[PDB]
């Protein structure tokens, strides 16, 4: 069993990814802040007869991430795959104006928070697993971007900055780590039925479907399967790329 | 069985993709100009326990394409998949000057021939199977682009025009056909050792590999499995995209 | 006097560009199929104290292009700038299915004619001018692409193929011709108020503006001033790029 | 006189941009940390008969930025243009290895410092001028990206993240601000002859020119001119775009 670390595993796309990798025979190491959801995931994988650990790790805390990787290596001796999927949102206009003045603007903290998890988290986790991958002459680095990182989107300064930034780091690490048997790719999901989207008002959802050529909101499973494909020992000639899984949706103006 | 049309099936990437889809349990229809190699493909397929047909088809000839699609429908009733992989190269600088005179230039015919096969052939083939995919409310269209369609390349005015335009058409068709259960994607391969590439000077291949982060020339098999994955019934939320399989290679200037 | 060839000069963007370049002090050579509007353009340029010639040229016809470049060399001894702006539209769905049958489809000739003018024509004009730019060790090649070359669009298989493909050739030629003092660039306009556009249903034009961030249809002079800038002898470090002038409009799906 | 804020104005591209805007008749407010160099710039602009102020502003510090904008509005009543050109570099591999042993890795504070100036600072500055531009129904936001944000680059994890992220933020702001007469664009310079590049070894510089189609390193004035064009009151239909000024250079792997 190859070992795969999936961050943000306790919910949504990471939950699906975690499940898919386990069913495929990976030993899954699941990272998240959400401990109850974490244990629930493990219960789900045990019910499906898979092999996996859960660990409470903050991807944006260097000391937390370093300690987590050391424990994996001491227990299992290898990290084959890292999926950097942990994320957060705090949308809002740069400045929101009505009646001759600013009624709201994106809080400096809201900006910093989203960058810390969605950009800096990717850097920390990858930096931490890389030396092991190099020594093993193998690895798979898989980074969560977004369709929104390609086109931009209203109200998503911080989130777009992070997710376009993640594609950039993916291109760098592709170049640096190839010569060591490591590939580095990103995935850019469209609208996916995780909890945020499933809570959207009725009119907004059906417009989102109408704007999507294939005719639906995507499922976490769609992305999980995409990560599994990219992680294959047979996907050694795929590196430095961004695979869109967005039902053909392009974010109009 | 699901039916997959693979154009340019007789050699290289087409041949591997044909062998690959039939092994996965598709019924393959192989189209190519090269009858001898086409027949041998079918033989190899049938010996391995697969099912396939070959037909001599010039993808650039509308009448040829239309008849061949009608034959398939008459025999098998369906077209689940089309891989538009057939292509040719005829490289050359736009213009080559010396002694104050043009001494060589990309001939009109050689511009036209690459356009005809690599661009127009993709249009004709897709256009012919499209109505059958619509009625069945299911389809997979898969188009052969190139890394060089992304970045451009010295000496390839014609090939790059075709391969960049193929991505354009991929985006249109995704828009037009998604409503009918059809996805439309492209693959853009990097350096892949087909016949011609295998016969390139050792020194040149070495420099090509040196420019490739994962550290080798690619194999037809790398591409074959990429189409297979995009062609999956479980890959229905991937559409309008360009999947790069280039080992991380970026064509620098 | 620097000499600038403007193709499709009789109307729309081309007409504004010729007026613009002549006002800046270029000697303009206007190429178009439409002599009536062509000859009037020159009259107006002359009225304003500028310098310009008109020639009836089919940019898709190699002989007619070659002869016309020769005539310019014989008269003026030089070509400093070529603006490949000549274009045509013939839209339509790839196929249109009803009653279980194809009731309309993009005709082979529709596809071909747009490719011929919008892609081939750019190749022929650039090929014919290039040796003179090479001898002079100076040149500016400027290619008409479209916002729709970046994102694709419903109903535009042919137009998108050609415009995405024009960007591809722009990248090749930049690579081939830079060492001779020549830059090669493209512009991708959004919604611009030329003939057909100005005649579109008010309600449709209103929808198009609503999709445009800066809140209006563009004007041909928006484009003409962008070519002039790229054409500048002080724009010699811009090459291989695609300048978008689209008011921030992104063609949603 | 329109008012333009140029950040990182004391050296390199910022200095040339400040001089170019002054010569165009803008009142320039130059921002930088480098005070002596700040005074010298003002003295240069005075010698050329222009109008300009210098202020010591750390773009990464919210309090400093908002105090600086408030002083501009109190003194001049308007901010027409912001060029966010300030930047820093701290290069190095994610993980540097020899002997299957890690000899260096990108320090966390190294990652954080570059993100702080090159990404967050852009967000702070724009956010600080934007309400005034909205009130006035006019504005030009112009963000410094890099060719490296397009293709990635060995040893530039932190810098590429920032510069690719800046492009993302550019796309968000285009969407949000267009309705108020405000445009938002990025420029992506190639290799430009500022101090760092100028200090490069002979052999590395040679190869850099060799790999640049137009045959030289760019000059800061190349980029100054491009910012000026994009900031023109006649460039109101240019928004949401990234103009490359890189001499046709594409960063090979
Ligand atoms: N779902 C979408 O609509 C969508 C769209 C586009 C792109 N994406 C990408 O897919 C990724 C996951 O999206 P999602 O929809 O499943 O969201 P999600 O909320 O369902 O899951 C995020 C998980 O990450 C965890 N998490 C958060 N912060 C963390 C930290 N600092 N350390 C560790 N763990 C942490 C959360 O607790 C949560 O379980 C995102 O990073 C995003 O970039 C999603
Ligand atoms: N192999 C590479 O290095 C590489 C790289 C980048 C892109 N590609 C591409 O992927 C595709 C396959 O490349 P390949 O390397 O396998 O080339 P290939 O020469 O090995 O195979 C091409 C096949 O298409 C057939 N063919 C040609 N013209 C035709 C026509 N008019 N009608 C029908 N059939 C026809 C040929 O007979 C041949 O069997 C190509 O179209 C090309 O666009 C290849
Ligand atoms: N105007 C737009 O809305 C728009 C938008 C996006 C991209 N473009 C591109 O910019 C260019 C100009 O578009 P436009 O709106 O000004 O359209 P237009 O119809 O007003 O002008 C087209 C001109 O090209 C000429 N022309 C056509 N065919 C020719 C041939 N074979 N030889 C010579 N000359 C020829 C026509 O006579 C006409 O004068 C087009 O090539 C188009 O691809 C335009
Ligand atoms: N010149 C090149 O080779 C090149 C190539 C690509 C992109 N760029 C980009 O264009 C921009 C300019 O590059 P340059 O080469 O001209 O750089 P430079 O180092 O010459 O100048 C950068 C300026 O920013 C100032 N600065 C730094 N931190 C600051 C802070 N926190 N607050 C305020 N001011 C601060 C510096 O003192 C300096 O004057 C950069 O942002 C860079 O991203 C440059």
Account of the protein in words:
Four copies of one chain form a homotetramer. By secondary structure, chain A is α/β, with parallel strands linked by helices. The first copy, chain A, has a single domain, classed as Rossmann fold. Helix content of chain A is 47%, strand content 18%. Chain A contains nine helices and nine strands. Chain A has a seven-stranded parallel β-sheet with strand order 3-2-1-4-7-8-9, with helices on both faces. In chain A, strands 5-6 form a two-stranded antiparallel sheet. In chain A, helix 1 crosses helix 9, helix 3 runs parallel beside helix 4 and helix 4 packs parallel to helix 6. Chain A is globular, with a radius of gyration of 18 Å. The relative contact order of chain A is 0.14. Chains in contact: A-B, A-C, A-D, B-C, B-D, C-D. The interface between B and C is large, with 51 and 52 residues. Bound molecules: nicotinamide-adenine-dinucleotide (4 copies). The site of one nicotinamide-adenine-dinucleotide (NAD) has 29 residues of chain B, from helix 1, helix 4 and helix 7. Chains A, B, C, D: It comes from Plesiocystis pacifica SIR-1. Chains A, B, C, D: InterPro entries: KR_dom, NAD(P)-bd_dom_sf, Sc_DH/Rdtase_CS, SDR, SDR_fam.
């Amino acid at each position: 069993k190859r070992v795969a670390i999936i961050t943000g595993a306790a919910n949504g796309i990471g939950r699906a990814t975690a499940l898919e990798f386990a069913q495929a025979g990976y030993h899954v190491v699941a990272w998240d802040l959400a401990e109850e959801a974490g244990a629930a995931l493990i219960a789900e994988i045990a019910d499906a007869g898979g092999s996996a650990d859960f660990a409470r790790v903050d991807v944006s805390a260097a000391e937390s991430v370093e300690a987590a990787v050391a424990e994996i290596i001491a227990e299992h001796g290898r990290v084959d795959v890292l999926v950097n999927n942990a994320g957060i949102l705090h949308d809002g206009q740069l400045v929101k104006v009505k009646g001759g003045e600013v009624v709201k603007k994106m809080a400096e903290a809201q900006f910093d928070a989203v960058i810390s998890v969605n950009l800096k988290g990717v850097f920390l986790c990858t930096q931490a697993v890389a030396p092991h991958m190099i020594a093993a002459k193998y690895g798979r680095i898989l980074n969560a971007s977004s369709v929104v990182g390609l086109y931009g989107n209203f109200g998503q300064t911080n989130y777009v900055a992070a997710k376009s930034g993640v594609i950039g780091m993916t291109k760098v690490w592709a170049r640096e780590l190839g010569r060591y048997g490591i590939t580095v790719n990103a995935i850019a999901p469209g609208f996916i039925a995780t909890e945020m989207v499933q809570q959207m008002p009725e009119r907004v959802l059906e417009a989102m479907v109408a704007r999507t050529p294939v005719g639906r909101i995507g499922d976490p499973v769609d992305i999980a399967r995409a990560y599994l494909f990219l992680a294959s020992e047979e996907s050694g000639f795929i590196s430095g790329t961004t695979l869109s899984v967005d039902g053909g949706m392009v974010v109009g103006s």
